[PDB]
Nucleic acid binder design. Sequence first.
RNA 1: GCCCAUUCGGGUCUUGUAAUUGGAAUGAGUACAAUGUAAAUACCUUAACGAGGAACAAUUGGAGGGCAAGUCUGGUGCCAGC
Lengths: 150, 104, 36, 65, 174, 49, 242, 40, 60, 121
Amino acid sequence: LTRNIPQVSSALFFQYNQAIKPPYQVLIDTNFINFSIQKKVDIVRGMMDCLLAKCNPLITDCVMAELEKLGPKYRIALKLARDPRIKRLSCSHKGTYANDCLVHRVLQHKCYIVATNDAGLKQRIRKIPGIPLMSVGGHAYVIEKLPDVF
Amino acid sequence: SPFGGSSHAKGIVLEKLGIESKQPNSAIRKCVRVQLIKNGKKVTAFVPNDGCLNFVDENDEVLLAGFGRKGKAKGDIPGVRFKVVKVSGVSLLALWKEKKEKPR
Amino acid sequence: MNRKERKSTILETLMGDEASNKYFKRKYNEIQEKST
Amino acid sequence: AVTIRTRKVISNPLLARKQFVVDVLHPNRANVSKDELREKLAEVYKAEKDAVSVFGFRTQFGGGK
Amino acid sequence: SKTYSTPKRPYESSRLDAELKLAGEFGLKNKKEIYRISFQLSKIRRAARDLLTRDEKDPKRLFEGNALIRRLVRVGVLSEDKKKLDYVLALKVEDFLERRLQTQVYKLGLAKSVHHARVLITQRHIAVGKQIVNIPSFMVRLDSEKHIDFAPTSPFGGARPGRVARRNAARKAE
Amino acid sequence: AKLVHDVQKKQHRERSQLTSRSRYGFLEKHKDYVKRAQDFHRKQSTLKV
Amino acid sequence: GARGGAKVVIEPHRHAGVYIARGKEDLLVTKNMAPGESVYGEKRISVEEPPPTKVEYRVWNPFRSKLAAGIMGGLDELFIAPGKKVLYLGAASGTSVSHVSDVVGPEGVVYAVEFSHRPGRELISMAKKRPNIIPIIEDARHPQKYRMLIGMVDCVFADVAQPDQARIIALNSHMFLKDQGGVVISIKANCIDSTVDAETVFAREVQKLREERIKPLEQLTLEPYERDHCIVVGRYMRSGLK
Amino acid sequence: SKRKEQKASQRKERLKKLAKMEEEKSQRDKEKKKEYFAQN
Amino acid sequence: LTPKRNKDNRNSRVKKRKKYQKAQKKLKSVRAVYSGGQSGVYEGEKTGIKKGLTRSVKFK
Amino acid sequence: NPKAFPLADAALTQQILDVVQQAANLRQLKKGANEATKTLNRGISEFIIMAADCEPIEILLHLPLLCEDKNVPYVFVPSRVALGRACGVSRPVIAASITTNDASAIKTQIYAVKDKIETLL
RNA sequence: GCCCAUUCGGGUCUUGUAAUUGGAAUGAGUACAAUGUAAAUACCUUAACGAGGAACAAUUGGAGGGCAAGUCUGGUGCCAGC
Ligand SMILES: [Zn+2]
């Protein structure tokens, strides 16, 4: 009888997560792009101004499907998120739901940082241990649990 | 702010409120009636540790400060906003850990 | 392992040495004394 | 055994002096004992032991010079 | 002056485990040492961010970035191949505080542990060439990395033996 | 521990059984009483069911 | 412990083909195909069966074999069953291919490819002994020049030490692996990228797999035996990826 | 046997720790749910 | 009238050492960290291998 | 196609054997053929060096079959007496090895050397 | 016997208690002397002294317990609370 308890991924400390070297990989998602636009900050230069390090953004196919699905009010968001500076993942699961796609994607790798803004996703991300989220705030970004913010 | 602008106010104790409380180290045992001098009024202060309640007796020129509960307790009374921090020149924390000596 | 020590089963292999017998006698005697 | 070594020597006949910087190197002793230093410096120059003067000493950290 | 700065929050789980791991790994005294090294790292790469966000071929970016990388390769936290400005952006606190004299003499050998390294170089034994250094937080430059040896006026080098050894030699030769 | 001393929370040792009644010894304190009484209550309850 | 002469029970494991050897301290043990000769110097259990016959078993030293550490750390399912055909990208020498061979058994085959030459002659001198393996001494980056001699393998496995790991396994699996078939790769982080660290390079490699149509399903790290490798198990979907 | 009783003994203190934690969390949330309504 | 304080608590460098090497030995109980590898000859895995346990994180 | 194929030219020779002398002064080097193969089949070996003019060549040619099986780089050097002068020892050592150690201050030069010789091979 | 995770689970002598115990290195000090300085102190030097509880005695808080032939309040025995 096969039980399955996932081991704590061995590039993690107690909660320090030494696998997050300063060239970062972030996970952009949908209402974070929308709030970045309606707070009028940029994306790559905004992340650089918040983290003082070179950040590579990533968007998944599930989040791109959500951004296409949300209609023509966010054509600015879609034109911004088809940026050649960002990269793109490729998901393989059923149901384009950004929340469980994101939190599954990060809890089986523990190396991405999650750039989110909605309440349930922030709650699940800060529930699971040792991955940093960032969010919009005022006219800049804000990091929640990176060990070296400065 | 809770008394004009100052954070601390010298005061005169009227009487040890609740000496006849039978349960030792209780809320109604650990109160004193302080006459605030800055505007001449009554207030009920909350000296910690009934074993060190009995340093202050009567017009011991006591110095109050706020209390600020960091939660909710079992049988603590509300209404007391003031704790004793210094009595007659010395600090009663230092008196209770018996470093200094109360002068008279 | 030496040829005079390769016993027919691991029970006699565990009986064949000394430190395990020492620990077993003192631990078993302490257990009987604790039960009484 | 100690040594002394002068550097940055400039003549100055406006006072008929020679002024310089003095590096004394003592491997294990404490310091170079200014009177004995003064007679040694007047010996290596042509001076008096009365016409030679040294004042601004400081032993650098860790000892030795 | 005010070198060290308090972080954006000092009571947090990930920060607490960060200071625990760094302190117990590089043999550190308190949080002020990590905060000083972290502060000056943050200051130099905050200065590097502006030189990045302005354009190339500006004389400011050109010779100020050359000045910054010359200073950082002189300290030694940047390798000889990555001599361009965004690796300064990709710097990290670990290979920046690794060049302190405590960790550096432990890596050089001659100490058998980081804590023994710290207690001997504060017991005044290790001299970089000629100068006896009695302080840990040195950030030894790259050129003087091979001049680390026991100082000659210290009984792990070749001086007279210490007071414990010669007192025991006296009252064991009696 | 909020505001107490260690001399305020020192240890109280328990007194022995008197030598005058040492034949039926081992004076029986409160913890041994409650371990007797709950056992007797359980035996009485299973007897009554 | 576990000296030569003790009596050890041989219990079967979940992955059919391998066995647990439970003595006073446990072992992982595969049933030897050619009895009588160890191949890289490992110890051998030797049981008797009733005409008296005597069959032997080999231990599986996880500090010197890759997938043994994944087996002992506990993978949900491999694809190396006792009947399948198994391709072995980066077969170094006999030291793991003999274990995969005698897991596979006398019916299935193991096609072991290798690019270097001196491990090639060692692999051939081992390969003459047991018959269920095929030694190929060709580069794993060119699956069109040993397409003549193999066909339609049922699970591939990968230990190659090149930074085009995903391209190697993608080309070999498109050319040879059947649909709904397994692919077990073993990435070495410090080998394929020295700059960025382990979890980032693992996520980049598993993203390259799910771009090359292997749907991954297991990631194990095998930390107490080797440092910073990982075992990534995947299926080859090709039809109905999601 | 004694390993089991030691695990049960420390399970009692884990239970008391969770009791204190849930009591503090419940009083904090019943403060927050009326601070959410004192804007009326 | 103070509590009994600690010789470990005196020097902060020591308390930030005896906290680390405990927490160094703590995470031999949440992961299985690399400890040099095959030190002697292979004496078996020496502490128990169980069948019905898979410590592999799976892809949802 | 000789038997000592990855023979290093002059500048790469000089940098790998000053890395050798830094390792010998940092106590991180194993000197000699049989200690080299012992540390090689123990596993702690960053890379190994042989000398391509020992009077029997096979007494260190036995090291390729171990090292390229256990996936560790190996380099021939055209002078055993120069490698002896590099290791800092009287007699000419013909097969040296660098142990693996992440508490050694020549990790950067070791990795630069290892990348150069993996590109060489 | 240890440690970790809402619980049953996981992992480990490579884990704790013992002056069993050994010698080495020191500066706080103390101090000849020299140094600095208008003179003198301090630092920088430095002979001779200067460590085991290194008692040559680091504090300030905070979270929990547990113990009686003891005390007190309440009640639906042997309980609940302070
Ligand atoms: Zn998706």
